[PDB]
Amino acid sequence: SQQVDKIKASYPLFLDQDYKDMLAKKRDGFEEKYPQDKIDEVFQWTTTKEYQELNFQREALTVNPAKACQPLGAVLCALGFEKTMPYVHGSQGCVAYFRSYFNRHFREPVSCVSDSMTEDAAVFGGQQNMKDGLQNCKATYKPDMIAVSTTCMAEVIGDDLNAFINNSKKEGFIPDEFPVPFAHTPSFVGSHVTGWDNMFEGIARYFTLKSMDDKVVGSNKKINIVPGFETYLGNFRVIKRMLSEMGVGYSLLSDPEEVLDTPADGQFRMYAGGTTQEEMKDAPNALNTVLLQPWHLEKTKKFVEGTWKHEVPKLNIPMGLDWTDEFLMKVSEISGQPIPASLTKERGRLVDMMTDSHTWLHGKRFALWGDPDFVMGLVKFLLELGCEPVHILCHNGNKRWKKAVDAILAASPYGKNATVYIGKDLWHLRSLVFTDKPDFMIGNSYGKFIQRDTLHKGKEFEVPLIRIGFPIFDRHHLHRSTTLGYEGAMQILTTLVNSILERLDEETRGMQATDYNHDLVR
Amino acid sequence: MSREEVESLIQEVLEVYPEKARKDRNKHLAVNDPAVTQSKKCIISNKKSQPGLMTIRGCAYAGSKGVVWGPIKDMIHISHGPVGCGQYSRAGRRNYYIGTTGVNAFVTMNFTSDFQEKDIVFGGDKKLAKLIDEVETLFPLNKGISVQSECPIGLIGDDIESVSKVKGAELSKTIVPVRCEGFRGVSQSLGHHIANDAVRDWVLGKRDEDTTFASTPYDVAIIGDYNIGGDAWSSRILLEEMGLRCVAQWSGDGSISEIELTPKVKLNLVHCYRSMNYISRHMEEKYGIPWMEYNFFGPTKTIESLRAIAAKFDESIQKKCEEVIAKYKPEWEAVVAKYRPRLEGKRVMLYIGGLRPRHVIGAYEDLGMEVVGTGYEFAHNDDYDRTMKEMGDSTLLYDDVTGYEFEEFVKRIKPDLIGSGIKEKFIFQKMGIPFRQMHSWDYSGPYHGFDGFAIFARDMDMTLNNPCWKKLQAPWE
Amino acid sequence: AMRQCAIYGKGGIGKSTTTQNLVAALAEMGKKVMIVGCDPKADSTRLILHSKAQNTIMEMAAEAGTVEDLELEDVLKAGYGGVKCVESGGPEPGVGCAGRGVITAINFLEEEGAYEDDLDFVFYDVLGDVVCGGFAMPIRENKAQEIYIVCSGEMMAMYAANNISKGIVKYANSGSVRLGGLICNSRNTDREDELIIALANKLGTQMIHFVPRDNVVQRAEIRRMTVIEYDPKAKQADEYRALARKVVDNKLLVIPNPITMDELEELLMEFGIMEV
Amino acid sequence: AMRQCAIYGKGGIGKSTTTQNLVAALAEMGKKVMIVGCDPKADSTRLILHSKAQNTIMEMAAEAGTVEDLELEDVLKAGYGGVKCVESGGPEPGVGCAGRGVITAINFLEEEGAYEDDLDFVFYDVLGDVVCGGFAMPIRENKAQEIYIVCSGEMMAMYAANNISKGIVKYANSGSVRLGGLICNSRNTDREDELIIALANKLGTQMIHFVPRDNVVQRAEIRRMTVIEYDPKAKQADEYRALARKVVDNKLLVIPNPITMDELEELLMEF
Ligand SMILES: Nc1ncnc2c1ncn2[C@@H]1O[C@H](COP(=O)(O)OP(=O)(O)CP(=O)(O)O)[C@@H](O)[C@H]1O
Ligand SMILES: Nc1ncnc2c1ncn2[C@@H]1O[C@H](COP(=O)(O)OP(=O)(O)O)[C@@H](O)[C@H]1O
Ligand code: ICS
Ligand code: CLF
Ligand code: SF4
Ligand SMILES: [Fe+3]
Ligand SMILES: [Mg+2]
Ligand SMILES: [Mg+2]
């Protein structure tokens, strides 16, 4: 039943006695459910070190992965170019998922097409789909560029993108000069970040490979910036802001910041902003190229060093205090521009915040996960704050990255209780936060189910989730935040210390029990 | 509005396409005639999508794992193949359930074989066997396993039926291999069919020679309600208040034992015809169990359904039916009194999957609203047959609509409200058109049944009449 | 009582010729036979139908829209002696996925009930190299129960036989499929019959028959027929009748025991390969 | 100016043997050569290496878990005349996806700079049953620019030539790969040389060399050697040097015009 003036949605509607009664009857009557005592016993077992050993012996099963597949990243890369339509050669189910996944994180339209290869295209190849698809997409959505990647079915059968695209042109399905860069993006290799690297290198190659002869390093006096897979709008924005503040000429290669944040003013804008084709064509004339997320930009780096002949600086992601300092000094060195008083002051304001909050941060223990560059930047900044990373997970990390993070941990007395996991998932991480409980988790929305599991053991075992990363689906507008630079470090620091204080208030809110420590001033 | 004008709009919008696509899309767009009984004379459906036109459709895996099998709560469902498909589909659909997740229920979890390149090249049957051992080790209370194929499994010829049989026997477990590789068929729809057949072949006959279940004459099953935001629960409560016993619901909050008990019921109540008519026909052919379509969207359809269902039984049930209808009458009348004056005359366009585009029309009409365009991603012509009589004359019908078409149609028809999916939502909000998600219920619901109608009405009003929609134009422009 | 057989062996060793002549001989003695072509070249039923074509399952699926729109009547055709013929179809070389074509085709035949039980034999004619799971579709459970491997007394043909047996062991142990023997399609090599008989023993099987190299085969082939239809009383026609009878009466069905490369080299050396 | 070449032809026609014997002769001349085996049975370099075990890219990847963990010097070996040998590898028959194995292996070689170093030649040795896109990996842009098709005077072998040429066309029209010639690996048929010369012209290419049938080829193979290594002064060894010289000096690179199965039947009757 409903009271018309206080209508109940599913929660708390189904807490009503008649629904509870009906659900009890359904369970007991027909579900043949294990008895509750058996369920409790198994749950308790899944929190143990014995279960953890079984859990970490897994060789074949993955449970709750913390990665996605290549073409997701290719699509995001392609969205960063002016009037460019991402186009995924292969099966259309993929594209419905890519668009939805991004819709939910950015709360924005995400435009991408498929050429809808079906069973007979698997068998005969997708050449005809590419021909009709390119002509159709061009006629209908009028992009200036189509950026082609692949789904796994087209990768198994070896559809030759290059050949298929050139035959579409030779047979007049699309104009010969119409830009159609491409990249093979097999989902059974690496992860979504690998797809971003592959797509970018494909686009870079398409615009520069054949015209290197008239290029001269340094002649346009700019620095190229390659952001990598990035889902915080604030991160594109803060890099542009700091470089402009320094008076450094720059070119951000793949810049989806406008198309992922169009105004609601009465019109739908399928495209907005982005890196121009002229910017890509002119990129070899830059002083140098900086890669913001080097641990998934290795193919790009090979191309940029070997073909554009840029001496790509060996720089970590600009996260936290030290690595933002190093980023600015290297940009200063490359461009000849001094670091301006305004950025020096910003730095000092982050340091001020660190001094102001250090007592609540000291010794706090974290589990965390995400992509390799993001995770290592977060680990580095946690150490700067006097926090203890304890469980560091990167499902899509590799052995060289893991050794690099171990070295960062070893360089700080706050890294002594930390372990780095690669190729492990969030079901592994679940065991870890039970057997070696941290104070908080820092991760994406998938972490909410771990928090739920830990609370069921008991309030004193609950590990609250702090949402930083991708995807974030169960809060609104966090994609607008910043994690890079001094600005991102300030946002992260604020989120951490106030997560700590929020939990302490919750734990001290008990009238005449714990509220002796419910201080007004912290 | 006006038949010649709608036909004019269709031809104008079609002008942008190359000839091949233009010729095809022409067959998938129609101006309704409620008179017409054979929709094949008016619209074509369930055909392959044109390449590069931004279809809204998904794949057979979505139709099998995402829709039919995924909701079954005490089984573990393996997304078999690379990591992508299971991750994008993890907990995206609100098929609600009661359980202890990770212990006796597993719906929100993502199990996968995470195929790597060596698995493609050397095949994944050995990995799948080992994966099944590890599932049994770490999740001992699971009551069965399904193996949901992604694209590569279908190409490379892995023998998942043999693996399911051998491991099934070795562990005395029901293991269900499903060939729902995403390039099969043309949409989610063939996934429904493949999944229904897998239930038929591997699960449904398990209790064929068991007589220990005590059946009654009032035993029914809810077929094809996936309990979105609790939809099936707010339907099941009405059937049971009417004196019927709901032995199973397929597959929202469903359990494998409910599925196995379903051949013992007296009548199959089918809500989603599209996804479950296959197993419904099977059950009538093998078990002799009749089935009937019903509609619990809004009071008019719910009331009509309750009486139709009750007439299938005896006088005692028909008496209880009228008593249920009497109980809820002042509740939905208060909903109408409150919200119908706020919504009267407003015009809605819908685009959804294979059922809701016709099924929710009655509910909109109970609020005095008018559905001026509707269409489906993956319906067949027997769906459009049921749609044309539900829609007004000279309303617009569109099958497998393109992103471009849908936008152009909306610009000319200018609905007050649009009901579609997440990939449509943010496009139309930017055009200043109130939008309701009619797959996820926009994280609201239930919408089925009497209790659901109150929420549906509240939601339509909250969005259509929200103060944000007056604010899109800057005053200085 | 319906027997399903799959024919394997190196490309160009003579699988399709031997299979169709064998099948014609079988029909000629009154057997009801279906041939399922599992080779994307799609020439496995040419000699039975007369004309060099037959519309394939995959191309008819592409014509009709999807496989779901396909009717059995459109792709299953009768030829010599009422034998039923069907081709999987597949791509031209170097594009697409021939393996999936075989998977799709065989699932379709199963689903549409082409295995009627008005059949005494089903023969699958399979691609030489067997480079993926799809080309093992014919020897999964409830498909072919007997495998015959065509080879000859040449090194390359015998290695292929041995390599194919490696792949067989997996399906023989998961299911019920067995190796019924080696068919020696002669290349007129020295001591060819003893050499194949010896390889057969190593594997644990038999040489079920020795087929002579006869240019009456090339004659019938350009005439697009089997030898059985072309010249019923050629000596080569009697050879296929002999092979046909042996297959019908065969009871030797084993799990093969593949040998090593060193073993195969030693065997050929035993039979004079290094002699000039 | 490294020249990349791919060898195709009817199953069993002599692709691998011809390729290795050719390459031995090139190396004997002082050419630096790499052979890339593109066949899951991994028998493309057996006659060049023949000493010590060869490990394939796919096998080594499986052991290491992924291709990224693999190093080029683990799978790339030098044999007779310093010819560098590498095998894609792949599954045993009837399981997995050998096509993808070839894609993966050639991608690896490209990424790890195999095509650096100053090679004069790279040869891809492919299997006879080119059943998918993966087995045409060797003729994509930036791979083989020259195709040699091994055939003979037998019908099946000419039909294979034509049908392979058919498959070549979509890559030739879209890139720079071209047919370089037919290699007649003789089956001692009547007027074989004239007949293959004839097929060459219908296609628009040439018969670059007629290789006699000589059982010394098989005796060398049994010893796991090329004729060049096994018996450097044999008549057949001279044939391969002759073949190698033509390949070195060849400039004829064309797009194939496949003919009807009817024209082929015309050819074979008229001879
Ligand atoms: N000129 C010649 N004279 C005699 N025998 C020859 C020959 N050339 C090749 N052969 C023999 O023919 C057999 C097959 O040779 P090879 O293995 O090179 O063919 P292929 O590479 O085309 C087989 P596949 O199609 O499976 O890849 C080998 O035993 C080889 O020794
Ligand atoms: N017994 C035989 N005598 C002479 N020629 C034969 C004989 N068997 C087959 N051939 C010829 O050898 C060639 C290849 O035979 P085919 O059956 O197509 O091989 P596969 O089926 O193994 O690819 C055909 O031209 C065929 O006419
Ligand atoms: S199953 Fe179908 S697309 Fe009948 S695949 Fe889809 S939870 Fe839709 S219109 Mo999402 S045939 Fe259900 C559907 Fe309807 S996922 Fe839900 S809303 S009533
Ligand atoms: S139709 Fe999957 S999302 Fe794709 S590229 Fe493969 S891992 Fe990634 Fe359907 S079954 Fe799935 S969702 Fe597509 S792949 Fe096919
Ligand atoms: S090897 Fe088999 S499965 Fe793999 S692509 Fe080639 S044909 Fe298809
Ligand atoms: Fe938004
Ligand atoms: Mg054949
Ligand atoms: Mg070979």
Residues A243, A147 share a domain: no
Chains touching A (at least 3 CB pairs under 8 A) are B, C, D
Residues B361, B259 share a domain: no
Residue C140, chain B, CB below 8 Å: the answer is yes
Q: What is the DSSP string of B10-48?
A: HHHHHTTS-HHHHHHHGGGEEE--TT---GGGT---S-P
Determine the Cα–Cα distance for residues D206 and D243; give it in Å rounded to an integer: 13
Report CB contact under 8 Å: D136, C95. yes
Report CB contact under 8 Å: A132, B51. yes
**Structural domain ending residue among the three candidates B202, B236, B259:** B202
Choose among B411, B404, B418, B409: nearest CA to B9: B409
Ligand minimally distant from the alpha carbon of residue B185: 4
Report CB contact under 8 Å: A122, C61. no
Counted domains in chain B = 3
* Alpha-carbon torsion (C213, C216, C219, C223), positive or negative: negative
- Residues of B in Cβ contact (< 8 Å) with A60: 113, 127-128, 130-131, 133-134
Q: Domain residues for B252? A: 203-317
**Structural domain ending residue among the three candidates A289, A319, A349:** A319
Choose among D191, D136, D177, D183: nearest CA to D9: D183
Count CA within 13 A, CB hemisphere, residue A506. Answer: 10
Quick check: is A32 in a domain? Answer: no
Choose among C86, C8, C55, C91: nearest CA to D131: C91
Residues A423, A403 share a domain: yes
Residues A111, A259 share a domain: no
**Structural domain ending residue among the three candidates B157, B183, B202:** B202
CATH number at residue A520: 1.20.89.10
Cα A283 → chain centroid = 26
CATH number at residue A239: 3.40.50.1980
Residue D169, chain A, CB below 8 Å: the answer is no
Residues A285, A344 share a domain: no
Report chain B's terminal Cα–Cα distance, integer Å.
31
Q: How far is A269 from chain B (nearest CA, A)?
A: 8
Q: Which residues pair with C97 in a beta bridge?
A: D132
Atom of ligand 2 nearest to the CA of C186: 1
Report chain A's terminal Cα–Cα distance, integer Å.
46
Closest alpha carbon within chain D to C274? D219
Give the list of residues 6+ apart from residue B112 with CB closer than 8 angstroms, or none. Answer: A62, A63, A65, B78, B79, B80, B81, B83, B86, B87
Residues A431, A379 share a domain: yes
Segment holding A323, helix H or strand E: helix A320-335
Counted domains in chain A = 4
Report CB contact under 8 Å: B158, C133. yes
Quick check: is B330 in a domain? Answer: no
Ligand minimally distant from the alpha carbon of residue C221: 2
Say which of D93, D163, D269 has its CB closest to residue C92: D163
Q: What is the DSSP string of B247-268?
A: EEEEETT--HHHHHHGGG-SEE
Q: What is the DSSP string of D111-154?
A: HTTTT-S--SEEEEEE-S---BGGGGGGGSTTS-SEEEEEE-SS
Catalytic residues of A: 152, 156
Q: Which residues surround ligand 6, an ion (CB under 5 A)?
A: A 107-108
Residue A116, chain C, CB below 8 Å: the answer is no
Residues A279, A178 share a domain: no
Domain extents in chain C: 1-276
Give the list of residues 6+ apart from residue B98 with CB closer than 8 angstroms, or none. Answer: A23, A27, B73, B105, B253
What Cα–Cα distance (Å) separates residue B431 from each residue in A27, A263, A330, B434, B472? 46, 10, 44, 9, 9
Residues B44, B64 share a domain: no
- Residues of B in Cβ contact (< 8 Å) with C140: 159, 161-162
Determine the Cα–Cα distance for residues B419 and A431; give it in Å rounded to an integer: 42
What Cα–Cα distance (Å) separates residue B8 from each residue in B15, C70, D234? 11, 36, 82
Burial of B165 per CB tally in 10 Å (0-12, 13-18, 19+): middle
Residues A451, A382 share a domain: yes
Contact D151, D12 (CB under 8 A): no
Q: Which residues line ligand 2 (CB under 6 A)?
A: C 11-17, 185, 211, 213-214, 217-218, 221; D 155-156
Contact B82, B114 (CB under 8 A): yes
Residue D64, chain B, CB below 8 Å: the answer is no
- Residues of D in Cβ contact (< 8 Å) with C132: 91, 94-99
Tell me, using a 6 A CB cutoff, whether residue D42 lines ligand 1.
no
Q: Domain residues for A124? A: 69-214
Determine the Cα–Cα distance for residues B232 and B244; give it in Å rounded to an integer: 15
Determine the Cα–Cα distance for residues C116 and A2; give it in Å rounded to an integer: 59
Residue C100, chain A, CB below 8 Å: the answer is yes
Q: Which experimental technique did the depositors report for determining this structure?
A: X-ray
What Cα–Cα distance (Å) separates residue C23 from each residue in A241, C45, C83, C85, D24? 79, 10, 8, 11, 46
Atom of ligand 5 nearest to the CA of C131: 1
Atom of ligand 5 nearest to the CA of C135: 2
Give the list of residues 6+ apart from residue A230 with CB closer than 8 angstroms, or none. Answer: A76, A236, A292, A293
Ligand minimally distant from the alpha carbon of residue C10: 2
- Residues of A in Cβ contact (< 8 Å) with D100: 155-156, 158
A94 is annotated as contributing to ligand binding: yes
CATH number at residue B291: 3.40.50.1980
Q: Which residues pair with D2 in a beta bridge?
A: none
CATH 3.40.50.300 fits C1-276, yes or no: yes
**Structural domain ending residue among the three candidates B283, B317, B351:** B317
Burial of B310 per CB tally in 10 Å (0-12, 13-18, 19+): buried
Closest alpha carbon within chain A to D175? A163
Q: What tokens appear for A483 in the block?
A: 């994690």
CATH topology of domain D1-271: Rossmann fold (3.40.50)
Burial of A199 per CB tally in 10 Å (0-12, 13-18, 19+): buried
Quick check: is A302 in a domain? Answer: yes
What Cα–Cα distance (Å) separates residue A202 from each residue in A50, A293, B459, D250? 47, 18, 46, 34
Q: How far is D101 from chain B (nearest CA, A)?
A: 5
Residues B150, B116 share a domain: yes
Q: Which residues pair with C121 in a beta bridge?
A: C3, C33
Q: Which residues surround ligand 7, an ion (CB under 5 A)?
A: C 15-16, 39
Residues A345, A390 share a domain: no
Residues A402, A500 share a domain: no
Closest alpha carbon within chain A to B90? A64
Choose among C193, C236, C210: nearest CA to C21: C236
Residues A383, A455 share a domain: yes
Compute the distance from residue C236 Cα to the ligand 7 centre, in Å. 19
Quick check: is A19 in a domain? Answer: no
Residues B399, B460 share a domain: yes
**Structural domain ending residue among the three candidates A167, A191, A214:** A214
Q: For Cα atoms D137, D141, D146, give the angle at the middle one, nearest 5 degrees.
A: 80
**Structural domain ending residue among the three candidates A260, A294, A319:** A319
For B202-329, where are the E strands, in sequence order?
A: 219-225, 245-251, 267-270, 291-293
Quick check: is B379 in a domain? Answer: yes
Helix, strand, coil percentages in chain A from 3-state DSSP, rounded to 5:
55, 10, 35
Count CA within 13 A, CB hemisphere, residue A174. Answer: 26
Q: What tokens appear for B243 in the block?
A: 């004196």
Closest alpha carbon within chain C to B158? C133
Residue to mutate (ligand 2; options D152, D156, D189; most atoms within 8 A of CB) = D156
Q: How far is A204 from chain D (nearest CA, A)?
A: 17
- Residues of A in Cβ contact (< 8 Å) with B82: 69, 152, 187-188
Q: Which residues pair with A113 in a beta bridge?
A: A87
Contact C144, C2 (CB under 8 A): no
Contact A91, B59 (CB under 8 A): yes
Q: How far is B321 from chain D (nearest CA, A)?
A: 59
Residue nearest to atom 5 of ligand 5 (CA): A157
Helix A161-170 vs helix A127-141: angle between axes, to the nearest 10 degrees? 60
Residues B106, B27 share a domain: no
- Residues of D in Cβ contact (< 8 Å) with C90: 131
Q: What tokens appear for B145 in the block?
A: 């396993």
Residues present in chain D in total: 271
Say which of D65, D67, D96 has its CB closest to residue B122: D96
What Cα–Cα distance (Å) separates residue A485 from each residue in A443, C199, D156? 19, 72, 68
Residue to mutate (ligand 5; options C129, C131, C137; most atoms within 8 A of CB) = C131
Choose among B42, B24, B149, B173: nearest CA to B85: B149
Burial of A325 per CB tally in 10 Å (0-12, 13-18, 19+): middle
- Active-site residue D41, yes or no? yes
Probe site for chain C from A123, A129, A157, A167 (most C CB atoms < 10 A): A123
